[PDB]
Design a protein around this ligand. Structure first.
Ligand code: ADP
Ligand code: MG
Ligand code: ZN
Ligand code: ZN
Ligand code: ZN
Ligand code: ZN
Lengths: 293, 297, 535, 654
């Protein structure tokens, strides 16, 4: 009736020389930028991070000009492959925020959200094309439709309806396991006994055996938007084009239809010709021009 | 380290006779002996005095490795606290330092073994108690109600096995990151690790291949002995039965075939190993873990 | 995509082609004539002498081939193909090297020489049947019905590694066509280390030998053969459990985009041979005619047997006439008449009866020596080894199986048990040995002459009793021994003086004081000739 | 300064100290530089291995710590020592400007072999904390596996472009490339392993019967596994007594050939670094039995020596000791000083140790000089101490009893290996003793079945096998030294010899000498023996004109190696005359051991042994006369009646 063995580690030696294009160095560089960069002899980002933590807003708004000024290699990396670089910068934010919060408590945070603002030259909605897929773009237009708030999971606690084996999942297309995980997971020596019983019959929990225990899970907010080109410049004899936009968490309920905005995001695709995909934008930042007070 | 329960009972009675309250530690250790080993280990690791003799070229290698590990622990702690202080973002500082830093766990820095020995009949008889742990029993009388307790058996040793190393924790090394990985083993068999699981290699995209290092690993000296009933204990018209004893640590080589002894140990279960077709439920096998030996001659 | 090439390999190929073309008081060239001979007689193999190859180019070619035969064999094959196409009009060709400068023992093989060409010697213990061996397989692709032919195996079952056409992107999915593929003959042979090569206090070694093509069915159990070929390695699953660290192989996972096939490398040394020769007319017909034309030839024939033993002329005249036998006759009704002669020498441990056995075993062509108590029923007769790793069973010869149509020597004959005595009785009555073990029946040939040496039952031969009262044998076996030579000791001054003088001469003079009329080779030639007359 | 993690070794300190010890150390010939000359001789001859007596380090002050470092961390220290030896070598060759041809030494390899690690407590007394330390063992070789190829470099080929790679093993693991390293070809997982193109090393496993000095209560013998690598393979044969130095290891084992699951309980073994095959308490191996093995040692460049070295002073002392006129009595008296008198018994033992001359006929034929002796007499004499002493002095041999043996147990058998799970052939008592002496006690209790196998051993020095799977003839070049007790209680002198010994009369004639150890009561001899025995308890430790055992063994080994007597006509005449005399004398039957040709052979062997002693190369009249006298005295025909075969207790001298 033994329990489950553990695994741990500790650093002793110095491995190979670090490379520049490795995740840990990226995180360290971003942490240095957050804690050091100066504007007008001020620690803008450290101060605003401290204030936000004091306010319970778990996010940072960062201007791309400052980053390109501080360091160009990571700027190019972030521009080229945001899907790989954004989580690294978010985990750097969370690492700094942990220390800030502990020291403040001296005198259970989630993963922080990165909000990107920009002022570079925009691109027309009619100029987006294949070359921009998965890159970062800046777009202008008018909001014409906002949807209702949806619910998505960020942490799930699940259980098996046959053998009552429990586990967890963290999100930060994830799906519930197709099979029970109590076999591959050799938890214990008596766990091997428990996985067989009543003569010769094998143990098979079935397909999709897991259920979600809702009272012990966490969820976030989600929303959809529609952006249209400004009706002044549309060509004659044609209707205006638009695009679908998705934002989450702290970028929800920020604008209302009829507002003229600047959007920074990622040009992506999804599956809904022969090999056609439907484009859309992952929102990174919203900038409003001040409408209808 | 040998822990005598007579000392515990004397301490309890000393506390009682002068008025103050105290808990029954003896019975708790007796009924659930397997959990108090680590409690005593943790308590002892909190009070060990510093060494008054320097480490020289005539010490064991294990001591050298232990001392190196402790020095490395201290160096990492000092580096972390200095780095945090230099940032400009004292109980809280040490707390945050403890939260973000790895170390070598206490089990990898111990050098001693801990055993219990039972309550003698004399002490219980003088203090008006019933020393269960030192009432001799035959293999016949030990049933499933005694599992998880500290019990004593009287018998004659029939077989003893040669001492061999039983691995407790395996060690690996990663040339990519320089970390040391430790894998606990408490089963008759285990699966070696393949790829590194440290924080640095975990966060990166190219992980390193672990290599096994025997010298850093944790081993135990293991023996298994069989004990058989005495003639005067066997009922009329029956054949004597046997029992299994496990010996670990510095207690090895203390039993030789042909000895009539009184072994002390914790009675614990083990997985079933018979024929599959005759398994009805969660059946188990029993063994004794040795803690103390006494001879009749 | 151009394939990488080894300039050295092509250089050796050209060197070998020139060697074949340019090798030569009437001068002649042997290799071209031999290629012409192969064309004439439709053969498959070429025989090349090693010294011919060695005495050229300062030995560079000979060395390169010697320590890198495995590397350069395909290039030698290509060169031979080109030469034969140029000088002569599917066929599998084999080369055969032989006459190497030196020979190795089975006890002195090292992993350094793996993949090189050497020569070894040993005694054959077992041989298997000839079986077809997959050589160049043909497969049919599954995702598409393409066909792939001429796929090489290289000591193991190999599959094609990629579809040959871009119309299909198949890989690792194939089917084997057993109808349009070729095979070669395959045999396995087990050899044993020589008796005089076993070091002090140690048991003999064994080594597996593999034969192919036209070299199969050459070795015979119980013979000594000199082999030549390559030293190779094959998997050994049995090595797990040995101490030490055993190499393992895993796939390198650096440089692969992300978002287990480990193998064990244990091996054992075997031997794949290409030339096998056994080791034991001409002008000598004149010598044979001269020697037969002697008139007292019989006296010399008798005197040249056991020259190191004093006296005992009758035993010599029996040992002779045991080497030369009668004739086997068959009756119309099916009754077969024996032609073999059996002998038994009776004496106490203080006599010299064993020396006759030792002389016979050291001299006779196919002879085996064994002891009464150091033998067994399976040691005699034969056994069945059903653990043939590749297929059906095989049978291993015993003592009586060896020396068929020869002589079997049995010392301490009076210590045989009942079962082995019945086995010898069966061999004597009918010249066959019947095996019934592991559900397998078989019949064998045991046409053998038995030379036995027995001790008296009581230690000393009581001359008051008869022959039957002084022996321990059973009536059936005792009734088939056609000669009983009982040797006793007589005290006489001149006999003792002569014996002492002879013994002291042998110790002082050694080989010098022998002077027999005829040499052992001469006796062997005479007996071989004379066993073919049928009086 | 910069230590290695886990250890306390500093590379710089260790190399500096080793260099200083190498360049300044003397044996205190004791005043000269000991290791400078050894390195010089190594380079003159070209040897590559240096044998380091670890006890030499405790003498110098600096290396008092390097000793413990070597005993605790052999892995790092041995590599450091090898590199330091090569560096010191280049320094020695260049600092004096001897010869500008130093490329070979700069390209070859060096190595150091510790061989005097401290005294241990036995393999079974070690604990888990002793893994990866330096230890030593004593034992007897039983079996050895054939050479195992062990891969070091793997050879891959690409199945689209013929590009071939080479990968070196790394702590027992091969990293197979996952992509061709070409730019033209980049196909993934296209590389195949060609085994026959790989490079392999040498490996072997030896089974050892350990013989610890201290034995706890109730401990039975066991066996150990030894791993030898590279040049040390095939350097041991079953029956050899050896001393080994190596590392104490451990390893996990796979549960089955299908899965990759390991077992928590580990398997222990030893990795060998040095083997000692010589001693000062026993004779050297007979070189006539290892002819090809020495040649193979020379071919294999293994620096293990089978025979002990001789200094010039030792040879001079040998000559002087052989030049005196009391040599025979002195040598006899040296044997077993703790045994009183028995002059002729000790002379026979010494002659057996020396042995006769081996003839080898060209074109086939073998005569051997092994000498067989049977000891019969009163039960309470000292005839088993003799067997014990001869067993402990001889290089090879097994001490067996007649009733506790069997025909199979003496010759050969088949057993299933517990590691490889296959069947293997092992050796018996009489083959393990080849080249030595086999001691058999209580020869009269051996069964006739068991005795049957001794005939071939004593009549041709060989054995034949006809068993399932094995048919071969083995060498059994071993001498027989037996003992027997009389029928009843005491040797009755009123009966013939054949009525007192429970053996067939014909068997007693195959021995070379037969001794009748009779016990007679005479007050003078009783006083002498009692005083001799009671002097041994005067002080708690022994203190008993006797040569030391080391010098005796050295002398006998030198004589056996370097002298080969040959018989002359003057000896031939006496031999024939004496043989005819024995045959005629005594000519109503089974009253005496009848003379045979074996007696003439025995005289030849004994005369050759007498000549071989005292460093003579010719056998002469005195040798034959002494041989005949010894043969007659052993059976004491002087006190025997030729007619009735009885013995007179008054004509026998103690
Ligand atoms: N000549 C002698 N020299 C020394 N000790 C002797 C002598 N004769 C007898 N002894 C003593 O008597 C005992 C003889 O017994 P042992 O030799 O074992 O019997 P055996 O060898 O005849 O079977 C020994 O213990 C020994 O100490
Ligand atoms: Mg005795
Ligand atoms: Zn389940
Ligand atoms: Zn790592
Ligand atoms: Zn295809
Ligand atoms: Zn390639």
């Amino acid at each position: 009736s033994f329990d489950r063995p553990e695994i741990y580690s500790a650093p002793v030696l110095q491995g190979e020389s670090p490379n520049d294009d490795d995740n840990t160095e990226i995180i360290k560089s971003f942490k240095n930028f957050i804690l050091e960069f100066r504007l007008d002899s001020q620690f803008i980002y450290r101060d605003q991070l401290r204030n936000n933590i004091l306010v319970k807003n778990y996010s940072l708004t960062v201007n791309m000009e400052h980053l390109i000024g501080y360091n160009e290699d990571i700027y190019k990396k972030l521009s080229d492959e945001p899907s790989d670089i954004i989580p690294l910068f978010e985990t750097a934010i969370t690492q700094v925020a942990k220390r800030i919060s502990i020291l403040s408590r001296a005198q259970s945070l989630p993963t922080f959200q990165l909000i990107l603002n920009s002022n570079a030259n925009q691109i027309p909605l009619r100029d987006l094309d294949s070359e921009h897929v998965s890159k970062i773009v800046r777009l202008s237009g008018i909001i014409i439709s906002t949807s209702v708030l949806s619910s998505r999971a960020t942490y799930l606690s699940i259980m098996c309806r046959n053998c009552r084996h429990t586990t967890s999942i963290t999100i930060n297309t994830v799906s519930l396991p197709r099979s029970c995980l109590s076999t591959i997971e050799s938890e214990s020596s008596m766990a091997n006994e428990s996985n067989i019983g009543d003569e010769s019959t094998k143990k098979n929990c079935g397909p999709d055996p897991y259920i979600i225990i809702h009272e012990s899970s966490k969820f976030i907010d989600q929303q959809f938007l529609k952006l249209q080109e400004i009706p002044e410049l549309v060509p004659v004899g044609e209707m205006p084009r638009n695009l679908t936009m998705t934002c989450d968490r702290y970028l929800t309920n920020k604008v209302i239809p009829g507002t003229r905005v600047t959007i920074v995001g990622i040009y992506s695709i999804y599956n809904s010709g022969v090999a056609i995909r439907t484009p859309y934008i992952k929102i990174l930042g919203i900038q409003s021009d001040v409408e209808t007070s | 380290v040998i822990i005598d329960l007579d000392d515990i009972l004397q301490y309890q009675n000393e506390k009682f006779l002068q008025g103050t309250q105290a808990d029954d530690l003896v019975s708790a250790i007796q009924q659930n002996a397997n959990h108090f080993t680590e409690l005593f280990c943790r308590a002892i690791d909190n009070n060990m005095p510093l060494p008054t003799k320097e480490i020289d070229y005539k010490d064991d290698v294990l001591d050298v490795i232990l001392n190196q590990r402790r020095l490395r622990n201290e160096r990492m702690l000092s580096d972390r606290t200095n780095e945090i202080r230099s940032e400009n973002l004292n109980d809280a500082l040490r707390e945050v330092v403890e939260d973000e830093t790895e170390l070598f766990p206490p089990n990898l820095t111990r050098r001693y073994f801990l055993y219990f020995k039972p309550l003698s009949q004399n002490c219980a008889r003088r203090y008006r108690k019933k020393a269960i742990s030192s009432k001799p029993l035959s293999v016949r009388q030990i049933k499933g109600d005694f599992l998880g307790q500290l019990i004593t058996v009287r018998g004659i040793i029939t077989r003893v096995s040669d001492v061999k190393p039983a691995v407790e924790v395996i060690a690996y090394t990663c040339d990519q990151c320089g970390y040391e990985v430790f894998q606990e083993v408490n089963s008759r068999t285990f699966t070696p690790l393949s790829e590194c699981t440290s924080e640095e290699c975990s966060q990166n995209q190219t992980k390193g291949q672990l290599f096994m290092s025997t010298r850093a690993s944790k081993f135990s000296a293991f023996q298994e002995c069989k004990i058989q009933e005495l003639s005067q204990q066997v009922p009329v018209g029956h054949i004597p039965r046997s029992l299994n004893i496990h010996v670990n640590g510095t207690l090895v080589r203390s039993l030789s075939p042909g000895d009539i002894v009184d072994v002390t140990g914790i009675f614990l279960p083990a997985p079933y190993t018979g024929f599959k077709a005759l398994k009805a439920g969660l059946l188990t096998e029993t063994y004794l873990e040795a803690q103390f030996v006494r001879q009749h001659k | 995509v151009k394939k990488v090439d080894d300039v050295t390999g092509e250089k050796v190929r050209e060197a070998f082609e020139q060697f074949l073309e340019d090798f030569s008081g009437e001068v002649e060239k042997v290799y071209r004539a031999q290629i012409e001979f192969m064309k004439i007689y439709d053969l498959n193999t070429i025989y090349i002498d090693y010294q011919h190859l060695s005495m050229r180019e300062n030995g560079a070619l000979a060395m390169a081939i010697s320590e890198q035969y495995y590397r350069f064999l395909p290039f030698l094959q290509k060169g031979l193909r080109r030469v034969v196409r140029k000088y002569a009009p599917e066929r599998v060709f084999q080369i055969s090297f032989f006459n190497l400068p030196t020979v190795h023992r089975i006890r002195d093989i090292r992993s350094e020489k793996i993949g090189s060409l050497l020569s070894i010697s040993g005694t054959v213990t077992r041989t298997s049947e000839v079986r077809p061996e997959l050589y160049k397989a043909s497969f049919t692709c599954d995702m598409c019905r393409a066909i792939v032919d001429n796929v090489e195996q290289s000591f193991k079952y190999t599959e094609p590694t990629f579809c040959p056409n871009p119309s299909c992107e198949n890989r690792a999915f194939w089917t084997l066509n057993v109808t349009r593929s070729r095979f070669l003959d395959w045999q396995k042979v087990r050899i044993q280390e020589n008796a005089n090569e076993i070091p002090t206090g140690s048991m003999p070694r064994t080594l597996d030998v593999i034969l192919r093509g036209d070299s199969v069915e050459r070795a015979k159990p119980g013979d000594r053969c000199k082999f030549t070929g390559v030293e190779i390695v094959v998997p050994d699953v049995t090595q797990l459990g040995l101490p030490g660290v055993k190499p393992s192989s895993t796939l390198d996972t650096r440089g692969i985009s992300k978002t287990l096939g480990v193998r064990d490398l244990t091996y054992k040394i075997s031997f794949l041979a290409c030339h096998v020769i056994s080791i034991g007319s001409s002008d000598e017909i004149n010598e044979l005619k001269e020697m037969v034309k002697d008139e007292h030839i019989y006296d010399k024939l008798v005197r040249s047997i056991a020259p190191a033993v004093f006296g005992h002329e009758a035993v010599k005249k029996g040992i002779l006439l045991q080497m030369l036998g009668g004739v086997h006759k068959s009756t119309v009704e099916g009754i077969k008449l024996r032609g073999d002669i059996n002998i038994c020498v009776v004496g106490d441990p203080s006599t010299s009866k064993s020396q006759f056995l030792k002389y016979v075993v050291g001299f006779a062509p196919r002879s085996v020596y064994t002891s009464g108590k150091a033998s067994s029923a399976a040691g005699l007769t034969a056994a069945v080894v059903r653990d043939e790793e590749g297929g059906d069973y095989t049978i291993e010869a015993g003592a009586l199986m060896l020396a068929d149509n020869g002589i079997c020597c049995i010392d301490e004959f009076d210590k045989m048990d009942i079962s082995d005595q019945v086995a010898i009785h069966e061999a004597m009555e009918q010249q066959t040995i019947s095996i019934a073990k592991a559900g397998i029946h078989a019949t064998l040939n045991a046409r053998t002459s038995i030379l036995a040496a027995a001790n008296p039952v009581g230690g000393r031969y009581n001359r008051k009793l008869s022959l039957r009262g002084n022996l321990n044998m059973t009536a059936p076996i005792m009734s088939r021994f056609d000669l009983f030579f009982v040797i006793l000791d007589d005290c006489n001054e001149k006999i003792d003086t002569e014996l002492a003088s002879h013994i002291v001469d042998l110790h002082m003079k050694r080989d010098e004081a022998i002077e027999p009329p005829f040499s052992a080779e001469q006796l062997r030639r005479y007996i071989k000739y004379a066993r073919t007359f049928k009086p | 300064l910069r230590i290695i993690w886990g250890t306390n070794v500093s590379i710089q300190e260790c190399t500096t100290n080793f260099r200083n010890f190498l360049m300044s150390f003397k044996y205190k010939t004791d005043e000269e530089l000991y290791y400078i000359k050894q390195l010089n001789e190594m380079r003159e001859l070209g040897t590559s291995n240096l044998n380091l007596d670890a006890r030499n380090l405790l003498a110098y002050k600096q290396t008092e710590d390097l000793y413990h470092q070597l005993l605790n961390y052999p892995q790092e220290v041995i590599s450091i020592m090898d590199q330091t030896i090569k560096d010191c070598m280049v320094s020695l060759i260049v600092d004096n400007n001897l010869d500008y041809d130093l490329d070979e030494i700069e390209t070859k390899f060096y190595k150091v072999r510790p061989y005097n690690v401290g005294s241990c407590k036995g393999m079974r007394e070690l604990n888990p904390n002793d893994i990866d330390k330096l230890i030593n063992l004593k034992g007897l070789v039983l079996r050895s596996t054939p050479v195992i190829p062990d891969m070091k470099v793997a050879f891959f080929k690409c199945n689209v472009c013929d590009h071939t790679m080479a990968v070196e093993i790394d702590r027992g693991v091969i990293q197979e490339p996952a992509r061709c390293e070409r730019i033209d070809c980049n196909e993934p997982n296209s590389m195949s392993l060609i085994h026959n193109r790989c490079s392999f090393a040498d490996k072997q496993v030896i089974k050892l019967q350990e013989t610890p000095d201290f034995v706890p209560d109730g401990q039975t013998p066991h066996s150990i596994s030894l791993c030898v690598y590279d040049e040390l393979v095939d350097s041991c044969r079953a029956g050899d007594r050896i001393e080994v130095t190596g590392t104490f290891r451990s390893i996990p084992i796979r549960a089955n050939s299908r899965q990759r699951v390991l077992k928590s309980l580990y398997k222990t073994y030893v990795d060998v670094v040095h083997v000692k095959k010589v001693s000062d308490k026993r004779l050297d191996v007979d070189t006539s039995t290892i002819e090809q093995e020495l040649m193979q040692n020379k071919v294999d460049h293994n620096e293990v020596e089978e025979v002990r070295q001789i200094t010039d002073q030792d040879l001079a002392k040998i000559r002087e000791v052989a030049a005196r006129e009391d040599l025979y009595s002195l040598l006899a008296r040296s044997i077993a000083p703790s045994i009183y008198e028995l002059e002729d018994v000790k002379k026979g033992i010494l002659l057996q140790l020396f042995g006769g001359t081996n003839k080898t006929f060209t074109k086939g034929g073998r005569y051997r000089g092994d000498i067989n002796i049977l000891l019969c007499g009163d039960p309470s004499t000292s005839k088993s101490q003799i067997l014990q002493y001869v067993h402990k002095i001889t290089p090879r041999g097994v001490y067996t009893s007649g009733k506790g043996s069997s025909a199979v147990g003496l010759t050969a058998y088949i057993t299933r290996d517990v590691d490889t799970k296959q069947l293997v052939l092992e050796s018996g008592a009489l083959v393990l003793s080849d080249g030595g002496v086999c001691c058999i006690d209580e020869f009269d209790k051996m069964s006739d079945s068991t005795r049957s196998v001794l005939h071939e051993v004593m009549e041709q020095q060989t054995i034949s096998i006809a068993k399932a799977g094995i048919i071969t003839t083995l060498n059994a070049r071993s001498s027989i030294l037996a003992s027997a007790n009389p029928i009843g209680s005491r040797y009755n002198p009123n009966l013939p010899v054949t009525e007192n010994i429970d053996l067939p009369p014909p068997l007693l004639s195959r021995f070379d000498l037969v001794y009748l150890v009779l016990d007679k009561v005479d007050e003078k001899n009783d006083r002498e023996l009692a005083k001799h025995l009671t002097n041994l308890y005067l002080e708690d430790k022994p203190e008993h004109d006797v040569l030391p055992v080391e010098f005796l063994t050295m002398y006998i080994s030198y004589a056996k190696e370097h002298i080969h007597p040959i018989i002359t006509e003057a000896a031939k005449t006496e031999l024939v005359r004496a043989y005819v005399g024995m045959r005629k004398m005594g000519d109503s039957d089974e009253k005496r051991i009848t003379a045979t040709t074996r007696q003439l052979e025995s005289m030849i062997r004994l005369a050759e042994a007498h000549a071989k002693m005292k460093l003579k190369n010719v056998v002469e009249l005195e040798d034959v006369q002494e041989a005949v006298r010894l043969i007659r005295s052993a059976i004491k025909d002087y006190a025997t009646d030729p007619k009735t075969g009885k013995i007179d207790m008054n004509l026998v001298q103690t």
